[PDB]
């Protein structure tokens, strides 16, 4: 029976988290503009994946997005994932 409005959660991918991801990817020095670029690239990636996952969910007339929905959506886009299904 209540609420809470989600806004600007992309800023939750913080500068330290982006730096950690770059370190694992072997990056040594990061310019100041990389952070807003990474956020934009992550938003698009998730939009494309969430869009397909939610399409499988609705098709099945469910209201719950399942790990399988995500796994089939990742597969359709050529990004197979092992560890939940594939």
């Amino acid at each position: 029976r209540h609420r809470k409005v989600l806004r600007d959660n992309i800023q939750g991918i913080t500068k330290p988290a982006i730096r950690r991801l770059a370190r694992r990817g072997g990056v040594k020095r990061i310019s100041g503009l990389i952070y807003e670029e990474t956020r934009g690239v992550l938003k698009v990636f998730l939009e494309n994946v969430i869009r397909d996952a939610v399409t499988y969910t609705e098709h099945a007339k469910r209201k719950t997005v399942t790990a399988m929905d995500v796994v089939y959506a990742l597969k359709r886009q050529g990004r197979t994932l092992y560890g939940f299904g594939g």
């Binding site: 913080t14 990061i30 990636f45 995500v70």
Partner: protein
Amino acid sequence: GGVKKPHRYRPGTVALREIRRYQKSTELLIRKLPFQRLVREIAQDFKTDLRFQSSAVMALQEASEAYLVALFEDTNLCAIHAKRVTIMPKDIQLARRIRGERA
């Protein structure tokens, strides 16, 4: 000086220390709750009233960090090809044009 110059690693030394560290570990590098809200927010803007199995969200996080990390390796190759050690937005864009993506 008295207690002389407080020790200071040169720029780059801690950064290399960091690559060695994160490259040998496997944990998720993005905080969990904030990544869950980002997921709920994008989902909601497509269809309201959706619920999520907690493992569905974990699957999106693993996929996302695996996608970003591989994109930073390619971006790092574009910076070095240009004789720099600093990755820039143009390096990320070059990597995605060649990968055949866009946005």
